[PDB]
Amino acid sequence: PGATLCLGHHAVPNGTLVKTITDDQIEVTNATELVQSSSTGKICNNPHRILDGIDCTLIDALLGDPHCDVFQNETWDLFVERSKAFSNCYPYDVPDYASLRSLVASSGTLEFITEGFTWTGVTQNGGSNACKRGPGSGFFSRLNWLTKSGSTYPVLNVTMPNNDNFDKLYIWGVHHPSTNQEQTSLYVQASGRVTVSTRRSQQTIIPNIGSRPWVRGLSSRISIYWTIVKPGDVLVINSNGNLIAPRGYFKMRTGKSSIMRSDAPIDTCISECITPNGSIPNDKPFQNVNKITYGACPKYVKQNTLKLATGMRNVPEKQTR
Amino acid sequence: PGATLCLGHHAVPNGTLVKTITDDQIEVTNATELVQSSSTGKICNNPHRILDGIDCTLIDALLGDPHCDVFQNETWDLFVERSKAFSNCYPYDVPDYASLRSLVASSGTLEFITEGFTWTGVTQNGGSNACKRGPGSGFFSRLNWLTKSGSTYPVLNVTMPNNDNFDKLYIWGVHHPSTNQEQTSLYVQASGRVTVSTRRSQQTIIPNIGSRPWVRGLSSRISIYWTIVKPGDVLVINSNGNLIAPRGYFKMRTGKSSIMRSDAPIDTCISECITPNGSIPNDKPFQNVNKITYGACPKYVKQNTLKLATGMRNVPE
Amino acid sequence: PGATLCLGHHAVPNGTLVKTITDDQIEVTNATELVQSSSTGKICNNPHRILDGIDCTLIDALLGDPHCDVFQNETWDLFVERSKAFSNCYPYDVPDYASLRSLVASSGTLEFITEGFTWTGVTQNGGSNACKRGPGSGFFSRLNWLTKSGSTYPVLNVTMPNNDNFDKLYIWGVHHPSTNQEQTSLYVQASGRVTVSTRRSQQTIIPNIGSRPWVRGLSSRISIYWTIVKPGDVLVINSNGNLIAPRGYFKMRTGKSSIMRSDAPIDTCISECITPNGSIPNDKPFQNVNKITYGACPKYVKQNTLKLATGMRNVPE
Amino acid sequence: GLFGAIAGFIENGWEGMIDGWYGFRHQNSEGTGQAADLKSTQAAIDQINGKLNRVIEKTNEKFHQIEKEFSEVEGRIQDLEKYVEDTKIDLWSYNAELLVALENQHTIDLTDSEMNKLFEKTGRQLRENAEDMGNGCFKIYHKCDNACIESIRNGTYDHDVYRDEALNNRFQ
Amino acid sequence: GLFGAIAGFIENGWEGMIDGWYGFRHQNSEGTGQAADLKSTQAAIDQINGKLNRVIEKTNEKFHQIEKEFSEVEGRIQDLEKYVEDTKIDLWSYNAELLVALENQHTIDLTDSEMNKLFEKTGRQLRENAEDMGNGCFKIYHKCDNACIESIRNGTYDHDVYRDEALNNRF
Amino acid sequence: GLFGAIAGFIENGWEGMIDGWYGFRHQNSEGTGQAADLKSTQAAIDQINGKLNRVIEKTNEKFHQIEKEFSEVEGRIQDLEKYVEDTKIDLWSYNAELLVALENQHTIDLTDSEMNKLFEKTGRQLRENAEDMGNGCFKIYHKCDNACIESIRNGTYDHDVYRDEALNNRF
Ligand SMILES: CC(=O)N[C@@H]1[C@@H](O)[C@H](O[C@@H]2O[C@H](CO)[C@H](O)[C@H](O[C@@H]3O[C@H](CO)[C@@H](O[C@@H]4O[C@H](CO[C@]5(C(=O)O)C[C@H](O)[C@@H](NC(C)=O)[C@H]([C@H](O)[C@H](O)CO)O5)[C@H](O)[C@H](O)[C@H]4O)[C@H](O)[C@H]3NC(C)=O)[C@H]2O)[C@@H](CO)O[C@H]1O
Ligand SMILES: CC(=O)N[C@@H]1[C@@H](O)[C@H](O[C@@H]2O[C@H](CO)[C@H](O)[C@H](O[C@@H]3O[C@H](CO)[C@@H](O[C@@H]4O[C@H](CO[C@]5(C(=O)O)C[C@H](O)[C@@H](NC(C)=O)[C@H]([C@H](O)[C@H](O)CO)O5)[C@H](O)[C@H](O)[C@H]4O)[C@H](O)[C@H]3NC(C)=O)[C@H]2O)[C@@H](CO)O[C@H]1O
Ligand SMILES: *[C@@H]1O[C@H](CO)[C@@H](O[C@@H]2O[C@H](CO)[C@@H](O[C@@H]3O[C@H](CO)[C@@H](O)[C@H](O[C@H]4O[C@H](CO)[C@@H](O)[C@H](O)[C@@H]4O)[C@@H]3O)[C@H](O)[C@H]2NC(C)=O)[C@H](O)[C@H]1NC(C)=O
Ligand SMILES: *[C@@H]1O[C@H](CO)[C@@H](O[C@@H]2O[C@H](CO)[C@@H](O[C@@H]3O[C@H](CO[C@H]4O[C@H](CO)[C@@H](O)[C@H](O)[C@@H]4O)[C@@H](O)[C@H](O)[C@@H]3O)[C@H](O)[C@H]2NC(C)=O)[C@H](O)[C@H]1NC(C)=O
Ligand SMILES: CC(=O)N[C@@H]1[C@@H](O)[C@H](O[C@@H]2O[C@H](CO[C@]3(C(=O)O)C[C@H](O)[C@@H](NC(C)=O)[C@H]([C@H](O)[C@H](O)CO)O3)[C@H](O)[C@H](O)[C@H]2O)[C@@H](CO)O[C@H]1O
Ligand SMILES: *[C@@H]1O[C@H](CO)[C@@H](O[C@@H]2O[C@H](CO)[C@@H](O[C@@H]3O[C@H](CO)[C@@H](O)[C@H](O)[C@@H]3O)[C@H](O)[C@H]2NC(C)=O)[C@H](O)[C@H]1NC(C)=O
Ligand SMILES: *[C@@H]1O[C@H](CO)[C@@H](O[C@@H]2O[C@H](CO)[C@@H](O[C@@H]3O[C@H](CO)[C@@H](O)[C@H](O)[C@@H]3O)[C@H](O)[C@H]2NC(C)=O)[C@H](O)[C@H]1NC(C)=O
Ligand SMILES: *[C@@H]1O[C@H](CO)[C@@H](O[C@@H]2O[C@H](CO)[C@@H](O[C@@H]3O[C@H](CO)[C@@H](O)[C@H](O)[C@@H]3O)[C@H](O)[C@H]2NC(C)=O)[C@H](O)[C@H]1NC(C)=O
Ligand SMILES: *[C@@H]1O[C@H](CO)[C@@H](O[C@@H]2O[C@H](CO)[C@@H](O)[C@H](O)[C@H]2NC(C)=O)[C@H](O)[C@H]1NC(C)=O
Ligand SMILES: *[C@@H]1O[C@H](CO)[C@@H](O[C@@H]2O[C@H](CO)[C@@H](O)[C@H](O)[C@H]2NC(C)=O)[C@H](O)[C@H]1NC(C)=O
Ligand SMILES: *[C@@H]1O[C@H](CO)[C@@H](O[C@@H]2O[C@H](CO)[C@@H](O)[C@H](O)[C@H]2NC(C)=O)[C@H](O)[C@H]1NC(C)=O
Ligand SMILES: *[C@@H]1O[C@H](CO)[C@@H](O)[C@H](O)[C@H]1NC(C)=O
Ligand SMILES: *[C@@H]1O[C@H](CO)[C@@H](O)[C@H](O)[C@H]1NC(C)=O
Ligand SMILES: *[C@@H]1O[C@H](CO)[C@@H](O)[C@H](O)[C@H]1NC(C)=O
Ligand SMILES: *[C@@H]1O[C@H](CO)[C@@H](O)[C@H](O)[C@H]1NC(C)=O
Ligand SMILES: *[C@@H]1O[C@H](CO)[C@@H](O)[C@H](O)[C@H]1NC(C)=O
């Protein structure tokens, strides 16, 4: 007589292979995926304030390209630049474009405060047929193209102190004519000069006359620069020709704002994590969707799958089949 | 009549919670803290040579601002720059200030060797009331403000070969007048130019004439540049106005020297690890005081506490 | 009567030490080294295409220094620059030398395509005795030194569209004269200017006149610049003096090519991983030979040895 | 695994045990039966749930960072930006690979361990009334009805009650 | 823990054992007593000293590095300097979190192991003179006075001396 | 190790066992002999080879990177390049140090475990015919000739055949 009492454990018909210290592939009863490898293809419009650039880069919205006028005073957590964006104003370059783009994107606002600059002895509000605003010639909204008044272009020496308790971002420029005829016809002097300075720093740009590739009707160019004025400092502008003047300053902020290149459409949903491919869930610790991310995101890794065992070793009963 | 023998382990009345692979909070008999999260608030003056900048930035001590004259030929392991520091000489800027500050800080010395430059046909030792030395006008001790002699300023073209077996650091400058009257009054020529070169490098600076915001009474400025001359190389300085000439060179070293921004006072004690908050002990492997450190320091982490179990699971009675 | 049955494990008389969580030194029966710490001292010429610069830096081969003419038709996976290389043409500097060296090394070719620039009203093909070719004066093969024709140097204004589907690299320069007399003698205008542009960006250089240290007979200099033109973009060059003109473009590629400074000799063998000390095997996951590597390499670590236990604890009799 | 039970002296798992991770199967005078052990099941599940929640302890949050794709060739600064990111990605990929390997080795060992604890706990209960057959089964040397089997499984088995009967069957 | 002794078949710890980490308690004809076991205590102690000294294997030494706080907005170069540092700090923060989780799991298992080792060693010592009660206690089937108890504790217990007496009481 | 066999209740290893990692030594009526156990040897060998091949799982491939040696003083950009590289090297050196430490603790523990598994396997095989002496040796309470020894080692030992003979010697 007697009895038998056998101890045992379960097994499942369909285990999953995982990796361990000793095995590259060994079978357990269950596992869970640690790498997020898919996106919806859409950027969720909440909880971050997403600003679709549409046809406009951030820089073109900053300068005030007319087809970007709709972005005046805009704010964002994430500015989204589309590959369809285009410029449609005066042809320009920004030496250190990437830094200006970065510092504006991080500031998260285009809030612009007009200031009463006094430009004695010059003509203001120059325009071009390459930057149409309505039916007539026009210019970047936030910039003031100064040229000679009557027969003279005086040495300009203007000042704008910062009496506020916030930093001012000033955007300004220098115009490069294509011919000596343009230089003297617009600025009298055969060679211009623009010096912008604060108490601790200064920038001096000398224009160069000559042809650049034809763009939107023009072989001439404008070069864009910027200056930050802290509280208690003062902006001084010194120029005897070729100045592209600011009309005021942009307010600067610090916060969570950034910028992203993406063609993904913006949808009404909720997602903390955004990639150029679209939003992704952040419940997993890793992701293989894109190394470019914004928000509360899983860490990017190279693996497309990583299985964490959630069960014991699966040892099926051996069969004679 | 038999006996009983029970095997067991100790426990303590109040253990401490630690984290494991499977539990974020489980109780063991004892643990030890792995994150240093406090400081004395003071920088210990040993074992590193600490140089308190007091009222002076490293750059102002380098150029030779008069209230920084006491720092001449000084050396340091760690130069400490204070937030109360101020400049009190000619208003200036350094393009790539951060790199000049870094390369001098890492060299660890202000040792300056005067060299016999000959400046033919110009006046030496220009000064300003914005940079007084005693009651009279003065200038940065290590720079030589050259102006016209009589009614002329000739083209200067001078040479200084490096015949030593070490690198020389030369600090020089360009003066930016505020008006054309200053320009021709000081340098005769209506437009200056400064070219400083070695065999492998060259820099030409054109002064910008015009008004800048008032600083210590002046709307003019000086811009500071530097040139390193290796053994066997040669310094050439070429200028027809606005040169702020070097008086010699700084000796360069390589080593453990650095610079730190801090207002922690300096105390007489011993500590290997220095943060802007003050010295911290380095017995623990991690620290949460400051990501800025100098010396043998625990690694900076985000956690304010991490408990290493030093005992078994605590199972109280 | 009965029997005894003992269970046991093997041992060796003298094991090897390994590190664990609890022990810096514990003896096991066997271990294997995880850190590659030696090199053969030679760079194996397979499987990567090795190009020995010998006497030439990559930049001097790019410009066409005459003793580097042999590299015109060359390509590489790894360009090897030797510490004995020397320049022997017109004295020059490259602002952002390191970036130009890097983008060329990464392109892996010096393939040069000549373009028919029309330089109206100037003399072409200037040379110097500081850059000898045969019995005469000469110049960088890929650059075209323009000077006045007759008594005039007109405003040069040429364009070159990129209608290919690859990027074009243009190398150009600016000549810095040593005196005003050579300036006007070569270019008529008292002040030169070189503007090179594409649709979205531009570079403007003003030449610098002045005396520099003597190099191969000359106090003057050339500064080297570059411009990449993408498909569908356009190059424009505009100048009224001192232009060192491109003769064409370098075809750029993208790929696995790089550059390394090394004096290790090149040998006939096979090795995936290259360091400046020579090739190293890559069977181990770590290496202590050099943080500079090329190829499928172990990761660089500071330890010169790390032992992975491959056996049990060694308990000798 | 380190303890030698799962995939060890226990030949295989039971696909028919669907209500628990570890359990008992018995044969006695009243037939055969199967029952899951809740305590051992719970101990392993709590630990795996514990480590799972530690791993997914929610993610870091990043906003403005560096650029990681580039439309122009630039040289030194872009080399460094790419190198910084590639370095970061390689180190995180290494961290992820080491994490799952360590976690999974430990999960196989801890589930192995719970099987062994249940087996040793059962044997201590039976004292001198049973012998270990070596395959996870005990031969019980006395008549053990369903009530008696249940008493073993719920921890209320009084070994003294059957000790005399079992000792005579064991020794002869 | 992996071995099922501490917080396992041993129900709780002894707050009264202040002279060791592991030990013995007995009841016999002469009363009750407690004694710490030095060898098992030291084995766990030596091991914990080992890992503690590895973790406190002192810190690296750094001098001039990069700047990590900035008073002006600069853009690209400063974006990278900040990102480099923030990347470093996250990786070290992860290393620290993982280090203590692995270390502490292992410390609990190794001390659990040493408890189990002492219990197994004792049972082997007693041979057929005792039975495991399942709670970390052995029932000893023979007269075992204080001299007999200490002999078990110091490893000089001759099981053959009591084997006949003990076998007769068991059966 | 965690299991207390190697450098535990087994006093030392056998320098004379050259054909396997674990094994048997016996003394019976026919003399003494030694034999290795293949299955346990394989289990340890197999697992150590497994972890070795995971560790040396081939290397990453890198081509153009950043410069890491510099012939001139430059300041800010060069400070960052060196700091990036120094940061990377310290994190990898830490990874290598931790990897080897974790692997090596585990290699010692798993080999200890395999010794223990063989010992428990043997004892379960012997049932009531043997007693654990506490030093890794079994006293076998019946005549066990060389064939009988082989039967234990190759897993075909029928305990019931000797149970009567062994029980009377034990009790
Ligand atoms: C009594 C007396 O002396 N009075 C003075 C006036 O004569 C003088 O006016 C100028 O006089 C000259 C001759 O003396 C000439 O008539 C000028 O007219 C220009 O004509 C050329 C040829 O047709 C034409 O050039 C074309 O420009 C286009 C694009 O040009 C715009 C543009 O859309 O960008 C037109 C904009 O209004 C203009 N804006 C400003 C602020 O000047 C811009 C700008 O000039 C450039 O973009 C700067 O780079 O140009 C294209 O480039 C074609 O290829 C090119 O042929 C100009 O457009 C005509 N100028 C204007 C203003 O329309 C005339 O200006 C006056 C000022 O000097 O002073 C009086 O005292
Ligand atoms: C009627 C009339 O006036 N016609 C004009 C011509 O006169 C004029 O030719 C120039 O005329 C002047 C006199 O008016 C003079 O004679 C020029 O000859 C130069 O003489 C100086 C003095 O000895 C001599 O300087 C030496 O130069 C070397 C370096 O020399 C080279 C070199 O190898 O680098 C020679 C190269 O050919 C030259 N290459 C080019 C493209 O010009 C280069 C180059 O100019 C420099 O590298 C620029 O930095 O220089 C060294 O510097 C010694 O220290 C120095 O003494 C020059 O070498 C002579 N120049 C030449 C070309 O031989 C004479 O040329 C003509 C052109 O200006 O215009 C007519 O209208
Ligand atoms: C320096 O050299 C460059 C290149 O030689 C030169 O720029 C070129 O100018 C021509 C004008 O002569 C540009 O031609 C334009 O091409 C666009 C197509 O992209 C056309 O849309 C334009 O056609 C209209 O406008 C013309 C105005 O002249 C009309 O005549 C015509 O019927 C159309 O209505 C226009 O032809 C050419 O694109 C540029 N090339 C480049 C590469 O930029 C420049 O002018 C020279 N500078 C000097 C000072 O000579
Ligand atoms: C501005 O000042 C400069 C420095 O004085 C002037 O440059 C000097 O110009 C002279 C002639 O014009 C050169 O003389 C030549 O020198 C070589 C020797 O070359 C080198 O040899 C030794 C090795 O023993 C080396 O150590 C030196 O540094 C030399 O550079 C002679 O062999 C020739 O015969 C020839 O005469 C000087 O070399 C040169 N010096 C430098 C440092 O450049 C320059 O001319 C002045 N500018 C003006 C416009 O006047
Ligand atoms: C030589 C002199 O003192 N001339 C008188 C002018 O100084 C004065 O104009 C005022 O000058 C102020 C600044 O003056 C100094 C200075 O920096 O302290 C005086 C120094 O001697 C002079 N040094 C040299 C080597 O020339 C220095 C220099 O010219 C400038 O710093 C160059 O930028 O200037 C300040 O600028 C006042 O705003 C200005 O009005 C005039 C009229 O008051 O009288 C002169 O006699
Ligand atoms: C074994 O592990 C897998 C994970 O790999 C488990 O599958 C998961 O089961 C949960 C059930 O709660 C699923 O979550 C649910 O999703 C629905 C929508 O799909 C949602 O509405 C619920 O609120 C809940 O979140 C999860 O999707 C599923 N994952 C996968 C990949 O299938 C499985 O249950 C585990 N099995 C055992 C026996 O533990
Ligand atoms: C360009 O315009 C600026 C601003 O109008 C002029 O700078 C100003 O110059 C005056 C000089 O009289 C400075 O005034 C001084 O102020 C101190 C106290 O601050 C006072 O005690 C002195 O008696 C003196 O008057 C004023 O600060 C300064 N403004 C700034 C912002 O620096 C400059 O002179 C003009 N230059 C030209 C060439 O037009
Ligand atoms: C050592 O010194 C550093 C820097 O001097 C200290 O870090 C600073 O800590 C304070 C508070 O602990 C931070 O204050 C901030 O206040 C704002 C406004 O209320 C708030 O939004 C922030 O969340 C934060 O609380 C300050 O920003 C921070 N500075 C830096 C650069 O991190 C550190 O706490 C000191 N440690 C010790 C132990 O003294
Ligand atoms: C997310 O988007 C990235 C690109 O933005 C995808 O990766 C690219 O895939 C293309 C396919 O043709 C490759 O040619 C590129 O080399 C890839 N780029 C990089 C940087 O890896 C990626 O596959 C997308 N992921 C998902 C899930 O959609
Ligand atoms: C000690 O361990 C190493 C690693 O397992 C053994 O080296 C291997 O030896 C075999 C031949 O026996 C080779 O095929 C492998 O390529 C070697 N591996 C490595 C990583 O080198 C070594 O033989 C062992 N020594 C002893 C005495 O067992
Ligand atoms: C590989 O080459 C490097 C670079 O030359 C060697 O590192 C140098 O070693 C010398 C002598 O020990 C030191 O004085 C230098 O400070 C080292 N330089 C650097 C940059 O680290 C390295 O030792 C060589 N290694 C082998 C195995 O050949
Ligand atoms: C932008 O904001 C400022 C301040 O809030 C305001 O004065 C200005 O009119 C605004 N401009 C637009 C176009 O909304
Ligand atoms: C914990 O740390 C040490 C023991 O190593 C000792 O100083 C301290 O009293 C311990 N605390 C407890 C509660 O055991
Ligand atoms: C500075 O440098 C040296 C000593 O190293 C000496 O020539 C000079 O006089 C020193 N001056 C001072 C003030 O120490
Ligand atoms: C490059 O190729 C051409 C034609 O294929 C050849 O004639 C020329 O000599 C080659 N140049 C070199 C430096 O080998
Ligand atoms: C062990 O215990 C016995 C009796 O309890 C005692 O007499 C003896 O001194 C102890 N030590 C040794 C080494 O025997």
Residue numbers in the entry:
A (entry chain A): 9 to 329
B (entry chain C), C (entry chain E): 9 to 325
D (entry chain B): 1 to 172
E (entry chain D), F (entry chain F): 1 to 171
Authors' description from the paper:
As the main antigen of influenza virus, the hemagglutinin (HA) from H3N2 viruses has five major antigenic sites (sites A–E). Several residues in antigenic site B of influenza HA are also part of the RBS, including residues 156, 158, 159, 190, 193, and 196. While the evolution of antigenic site B is driven by immune evasion, the indispensable function of the RBS imposes a strong functional constraint on its evolution (i.e., limiting the number of tolerable mutations). Structural analysis further reveals that the receptor-binding mode of the human H3N2 virus has itself evolved over time, providing a mechanistic basis for the evolution of the local fitness landscape of antigenic site B. This study provides insights into how antigenic site B is still able to continue evolving in the presence of the strong functional constraints that enable virus entry.
To elucidate the mechanism that underlies the evolution of the local fitness landscape of antigenic site B, we wanted to compare the receptor-binding mode of the original pandemic HK68 HA with that of a more recent HA (Bris07). Thus we determined HK68 HA in complex with 6′SLNLN at 2.25 Å resolution. By aligning their receptor-binding domains (HA1 residues 117–265), differences in the 6′SLNLN conformations can be observed. GlcNAc-3, Gal-4, and GlcNAc-5 are closer to the 190-helix when 6′SLNLN binds to Bris07 HA. In addition, there is a 90° rotation of GlcNAc-5 when 6′SLNLN binds to Bris07. Such conformational differences of 6′SLNLN can be attributed to the differences in the base of the HK68 HA RBS vs that of Bris07 HA RBS. As compared to HK68 HA RBS, Bris07 HA RBS has acquired several natural mutations at its base. For example, mutation G135T introduces a water-mediated hydrogen bond (H-bond) with Sia-1 O4 atom, whereas N137S introduces an H-bond with the Sia-1 carboxylate group. Moreover, mutations W222R and G225N enable H-bonds with Gal-2. Overall, this analysis demonstrates that natural mutations in the base of RBS can influence the conformation and mode of binding of the receptor.
